[PDB]
């Protein structure tokens, strides 16, 4: 089999293939996650150079891993499908053997492990993908939001963003998100997520996708008009 | 030893791009244009053959349009031999699904598997990618009529109308202009041929330089029929739409 | 410049490693020659023992592949013996599997196929040898088939190999342009060997003692090599005519 | 049909005292109604103040003792000459025996 | 230079640079001395610490009751090679009820090292070893190099500044070879030999490692308080 | 284990399964549920060899749940039953075959029909109005052949079932400790907890 | 390009030497061994304030009697921890006992040079392995990607290491109490850290014979930080 | 260029430079010889005494294969050992299948093919030794010499290592001044002389002489080391001749 | 050892070219001219037997090869590469078709299998592409007569008539002038001979030209009688004498 060590150290102690995988993430469409007091919201940008697109069938950017956990990403789209499949298989395997669905942290730890493994295995390149993984542990109402990256490191975030211009929207969230006062409602949290995206997005058209995840496997995608209402309500408070 | 001669087909550039995928896409941009257009009552696939000769046997030739099963067909842009490898794999996948579930394979599931195969060649194994882009035209009872494309990166997307191969920028602009959601198949046929007629690098567009196909519900009572056009039938449709 | 090092195409559609393998073929600076009689096939080769410390009985580029097939090699001895061992294994296996002796042309094709593989697969180098197979085939009669590092092979009325192959070749062509037949019209193999040595002497412009030659003879149902003393007897008869 | 097992007789006895232990065994070795040897020792000092006997089929008994002595030696190499306690030896022997669960050592072991 | 990228490449003068670079790691290693009489064989090794909070790296490894070695260079390579030796001594006992001759042990090490100098993807071992043992033909000392060269000696030293000890032993040869039946004197002479390789530092109680094997003496290692007697 | 019955009425499928678990000499349990929900509108009951029954059922359930997540779509009962059949057909030529018989009751939301599939351990599949495995059919089929109508209500189906279980309780030598009954219809799966 | 297992002309493995550079970029970790216990402390180094710092796990339990802290490419540590836990549990299964701290450390270090054209590169992470066993008492080891491990009375790894190690050279002595050791780790972390030390961006742990390996709560560490402020504002 | 960086690559003249570089390692080794006699063969080699600390008689270089074949080599010593181990496997397998001990010409080709195989791929390195070997079989005595290219021939006498030129010339004299034969006992003495004469080109260090032989009459066709009195005698014969 | 070339030796360059395939096509360009012509009742394939030396027996070197009783092949480029492809093509006609269906494959499907083999040499690890273009002519019941070209990339195309190698551009032009849809096999042979004369330097006769047809069933070449439905191979190689007979009325 093809065995070449593609991920190796450079004289300055850097692994370039892992670092170049992050450059692929930087070029991907922006993703953001914000967790409220009793919910987590996942917002994604869609690049607007493509119309004549059929959005019924086009791969959506937020994927259910199980009924209670979701995953979105920035970077290579084809690479992300491999992680999503593996994560879905592991979620069913966990239910089968442990007789309990995965915790959000366990699932994150699994996906992160897969990514790390691809940074010191022969004949493979790292995933050009970072993920936000969100949901609620079974029988628990505390929201969860984790991030993973090509190197395989992962951590928990009150709110986080990845992809292009994520520095700008991280700036926004860093001064607009209070740890003491998490967005106390669905409406409140969805709004803060939509605002953060509007810093970077362009038109608030079908350029913003939003997904809300509530406790006990209650997950729903917002449609254009429902998001449009948030967009409308936000500029009307801006001119002031 | 052997490391010396390894091009490393599966590495990132410093910008985070996959060289071989980019160069395969460059190869594909010189292939004959293929167009897919979706209507409410069917789908059209139209494609331009590569610079002919008068001695090429047209009526027995197939370079662009392939049947994957009774409900799904593909238009090819790129290396034909690479495409045949993937096509036969897709045909087998479709039968595996039918054998397992006793239901025809949903269009997206077939498209995802082929795209996952393409993706694998960009991440592991040290082999060059397939120099092929596909347009998938098919029908199933979940989403009805569907159009997808896939390229050497293994990314796929859905479309109302799409082109691959040469002059896609020009072709996409023309389809973007004249396409409408309520459009019917017989209009979509006309649109596809008109778009190829304008984007072609040939002097004019003729029957011997085209492959053509439709997927219609146009079959007695709730069921779908594929029609790969004979050369005489392409000649008729060219006249009928006033291009010759 | 790595299309020069392994067997991939250069921009002009050439395989340089194959071409350089043809060059190694003349490293030994030996010429050989094969001709067909009515009933036999003869192969002769120059023998050069430059060091006095060598045992000259072990210095040889002629091999008995099977009881019926002989092979002479033009090229370095290690690659020659590699080819010789393989051909012996192939001929013996053929007999076991198919129940009859491997024909000379079939063995030549087999070895030519093995050579072709080395020109297409990167990890194997070509062998720097040219192989000339001889026999009296039970269907085709006296036979000469020659293989090279490109994996090319063909049958011959007669042939020559080595640095001075062209002189010997033209000499042979001129004889057959005269005689107008495919072979040496001679009953005994002794007289076919004498023809072979005579025409090498003329073409090379050199004289041979009994230790300067190597001779292999193929007849119906055995291939054998001559001793120094059998060759001497050949040389003596040549001088007296 | 080949029978990979035999019976070499013998009897062994282990008694634990307050601050000592004894392990005894007869020295006779037999097959069927014959005596192979009147003195073939069956109880062994295995190092680290451990004595062992594996009674029944003698070929298996010798193989086991000989694997256990080896295990003591490697325990020393791998764990800085730490003394192998009797409880740790017992657990280790269980794994030697169970490793051949589907082709057992036909012995009754006492340490 | 163009020829040192892997072990599978000769230089134009017929050298193997990766092997020579492996030899270089030994020269950087801490000094260790070996010497023998007809009854005993002794290893003395200077242990090297990282700083004053750290322990001193152990240099001497027991292979069997009658055999053991000391190392200079990459310690993990010594662990691999010494483990291999333990197995081979062990195999000889279990299968043949026979203590492995020190000379055979040397031949087996040579062949193990050689395979890593002739194939792609491997690297040579980066450690030198001094092997002492007492077998059926008496006391022995072997020097192993990762080129695969193994040599039987009366005495030697390897590592940084081994040359001093190596000349000392060369002078004393006729004296130390006769130290039969007196283990303490043989050690003394070894401690004296290793002292010719010291500069700046001197022998202390957590610095010095001694091992001995012989006629009626199983291979045993002395560290800590147990070497006070000899400093 | 022992008795599993199924009956497809107008608008639902009813599956009845015995509660006893017997390890040779003792009845270990009298409340065992011999079924797995494969999807919101598909239920599988099972009987055969100890251990293999539950291992097989849970393995099938895991695979269907995986398909549901991957496609965000529920497979039709027909498709689920074909998948299950293939697995059992694959197993019969294995090193050690699953000795497991199943009934699959599902409501097809696309065709708005209840469906009952009977599959034995060899992978023999049949779609039926009513079915059973083992000796259960020997005692019950003559009643079902007599009374069954394709237009029965759920309650009429349950009453015909009571009549079947009563005949089993009369003529069968083994005490199977009653049955657990479950109904599969357009609103999903529910348990009838008084039988 | 050049083999992954190549030696340099100075007799060093390039890849190992380069991984050592990656470790110098890692967050600081410190351990101090005493006759009363071994303390392990780390710098969390959250990359942004929205990152929930208690999800940063750089001190890890291996068994009840062994803990470990990491510095460098911390994702590379997971499989080393997995192996260490497996080796510790396995040894207990085979021998009905606790495994020696050194033996565990040796088992982890056997992984290190298993790379080539096995894994494709050395680990880019260093570990401090702390624990107690009956034969050798309280112990601290420094496990490197070269496969070498050193025992230490005190040790610092990561970016602030030679600054911290010089400081540990001064302060460590054989009679240190556990409490003094805790304050010392905190003190030296506060010195070499970029941001200001507190209970959310640094973490402590220890291993005692009686209670085994324990990670301290943020409340308990907050108390020890205040105690440290008061001792230093007193001469 | 760059043709010499990889084994098995033909240069534009048709050469394998890596093999030619392997010869350089051989030419840098100690001198070793073989002499064919009337009913046997003699092998001798120069062992350099690097230091007084080398135990004399104890670093043996000549190696037996089976019971009737001796092998000596110059160059990288471990490569020679590797080649002899392979030779021993080949001899064992031959005797296993065919019963009779391996004939010397058969054995020569076994080593030949193995050494030649290490010139076919870039994934291996050529052998850095020339090997002189031989013995007695059912057709008499045989002496062979094998190079890193895999090339080998049968010899009357042979030499390799740093002093190969000197020894060759000495061997050429014996062949001319004994056209009818040389006895095993004579050959032992002559072997000692030629090594002593060849030692001129390694003069900085003094050396230890080592000889072995297989002779149908003197050793029953088995390979034995020349030890004790007979060794001392040949040393004396050699010492008298360098004065 | 072990083959450690498990990576592609053919790769895309920045401009989208597959270098090794182009270079393989260049080797085909240097090759001796070969051609094929399809008639209404047959196909003809032909080439020049360029003998390397006059001492070579050129009948022992077959440039035109029977693949099945109804399918034949000729080439331009590297002869040795052609010879091994013919061996593999003959075998795959059996392993992946005749042993399954009990009949020989139709022309297009055998062409498809040969093409797949050539494609894999363009992507698989540690190999170079085949340096040949093939012309495969054949007949089968449901498709009738056909002629295909196969290139180094694995691409294949159906032709009415074509030429490959050295003088293909000139020969194709010559064929465009003369080809029509009403040619009988004798007319096509005559055109093949005329076309081939242009690219041939010296001697032009039955001993320097190799020519075969796919035509009528030859029961005299079957080797047995008594099964009415087995009627014999459609592939036939013209003799030296048959070629010279047609070179007079030329």
From Swiss-Prot, chain E:
Protein name as annotated: Proteasome subunit alpha type-6
Additional remark text: Present with 7210 molecules/cell in log phase SD medium.
Keyword Transmembrane helix attributed: no
Record family assignment: Belongs to the peptidase T1A family.
Keyword terms of this UniProt record: Cytoplasm, Isopeptide bond, Nucleus, Phosphoprotein, Proteasome, Ubl conjugation
Chief subcellular location: cytoplasm
GO cellular component: nucleus; proteasome complex; proteasome core complex, alpha-subunit complex; proteasome storage granule
Species of origin: Saccharomyces cerevisiae (strain ATCC 204508 / S288c) (Baker's yeast)
Subcellular location(s) of the protein: Cytoplasm; Nucleus
Positions bearing Phosphoserine: 11
PANTHER family tied to this protein: PROTEASOME SUBUNIT ALPHA/BETA
Pfam name, any one: Proteasome_A_N
GO BP of this protein: proteasomal ubiquitin-independent protein catabolic process; proteasome-mediated ubiquitin-dependent protein catabolic process
SMART domains referenced in this protein's UniProt entry, alphabetically: Proteasome_A_N
Function: The proteasome degrades poly-ubiquitinated proteins in the cytoplasm and in the nucleus. It is essential for the regulated turnover of proteins and for the removal of misfolded proteins. The proteasome is a multicatalytic proteinase complex that is characterized by its ability to cleave peptides with Arg, Phe, Tyr, Leu, and Glu adjacent to the leaving group at neutral or slightly basic pH. It has an ATP-dependent proteolytic activity.
Sequence position, cross-link Glycyl lysine isopeptide (Lys-Gly) (interchain with G-Cter in ubiquitin): 188
Native organism taxonomy: Eukaryota, Fungi, Dikarya, Ascomycota, Saccharomycotina
UniProtKB/Swiss-Prot annotation, chain F:
Gene that this sequence comes from: PRE1
Species per Swiss-Prot/TrEMBL record: Saccharomyces cerevisiae (strain ATCC 204508 / S288c) (Baker's yeast)
Protein name listed in UniProt: Proteasome subunit beta type-4
Sites bearing N-acetylmethionine, chain numbering: 1
UniProt similarity note: Belongs to the peptidase T1B family.
Molecular function in Gene Ontology: endopeptidase activator activity
Chief location category: cytoplasm
Modified residues (Phosphoserine): 76
Subunit structure as annotated in this protein's UniProt entry: The 26S proteasome consists of a 20S proteasome core and two 19S regulatory subunits. The 20S proteasome core is composed of 28 subunits that are arranged in four stacked rings, resulting in a barrel-shaped structure. The two end rings are each formed by seven alpha subunits, and the two central rings are each formed by seven beta subunits. The catalytic chamber with the active sites is on the inside of the barrel.
One Pfam family recorded for the sequence: Proteasome
Gene Ontology CC: cytosol; endoplasmic reticulum membrane; nucleus; proteasome complex; proteasome core complex, beta-subunit complex
Subcellular locations according to the entry: Cytoplasm; Nucleus
UniProt entry keywords in alphabetical sequence: Acetylation, Cytoplasm, Nucleus, Phosphoprotein, Proteasome
UniProt miscellaneous comment: Present with 21800 molecules/cell in log phase SD medium.
Record-level GO BP terms: proteasomal ubiquitin-independent protein catabolic process; proteasome-mediated ubiquitin-dependent protein catabolic process
Curated annotation (Swiss-Prot), chain H:
Function of the protein: The proteasome degrades poly-ubiquitinated proteins in the cytoplasm and in the nucleus. It is essential for the regulated turnover of proteins and for the removal of misfolded proteins. The proteasome is a multicatalytic proteinase complex that is characterized by its ability to cleave peptides with Arg, Phe, Tyr, Leu, and Glu adjacent to the leaving group at neutral or slightly basic pH. It has an ATP-dependent proteolytic activity.
UniProt-recorded Gene Ontology molecular function terms: mRNA binding
Disulfide bridge positions per record: none
Residues of the full protein shown: 6 to 248 of 288
Protein name, as recorded: Probable proteasome subunit alpha type-7
Family per record: Belongs to the peptidase T1A family.
Keywords for this protein: Acetylation, Cytoplasm, Nucleus, Proteasome
GO cellular component: nucleus; proteasome complex; proteasome core complex, alpha-subunit complex; proteasome storage granule
Domain of life: Eukaryota
Biological processes, Gene Ontology terms: proteasomal ubiquitin-independent protein catabolic process; proteasome-mediated ubiquitin-dependent protein catabolic process
Gene symbol of the encoding locus: PRE10
Swiss-Prot record, chain I:
The UniProt record lists the keyword NAD: no
SUPFAM superfamilies: N-terminal nucleophile aminohydrolases (Ntn hydrolases) (SSF56235)
Pfam families recorded: Proteasome, Proteasome_A_N
Record-linked CDD domains: proteasome_alpha_type_2
Cell location: Cytoplasm; Nucleus
InterPro entries, per database record: Ntn_hydrolases_N, Proteasome_alpha, Proteasome_alpha-type, Proteasome_asu_N, Proteasome_sua/b
GO-annotated cellular components: nucleus; proteasome complex; proteasome core complex, alpha-subunit complex; proteasome storage granule
Superkingdom as given in the UniProt entry: Eukaryota
UniProt entry keywords in alphabetical sequence: Cytoplasm, Isopeptide bond, Nucleus, Proteasome, Ubl conjugation
Signal peptide from the UniProt entry: none
GO BP term, example: proteasome-mediated ubiquitin-dependent protein catabolic process
Cross-link (Glycyl lysine isopeptide (Lys-Gly) (interchain with G-Cter in ubiquitin)): 108
Family, as annotated: Belongs to the peptidase T1A family.
Function per UniProt: The proteasome degrades poly-ubiquitinated proteins in the cytoplasm and in the nucleus. It is essential for the regulated turnover of proteins and for the removal of misfolded proteins. The proteasome is a multicatalytic proteinase complex that is characterized by its ability to cleave peptides with Arg, Phe, Tyr, Leu, and Glu adjacent to the leaving group at neutral or slightly basic pH. It has an ATP-dependent proteolytic activity.
Protein's name according to its UniProt entry: Proteasome subunit alpha type-2
Phylogenetic classification of the source organism: Eukaryota, Fungi, Dikarya, Ascomycota, Saccharomycotina
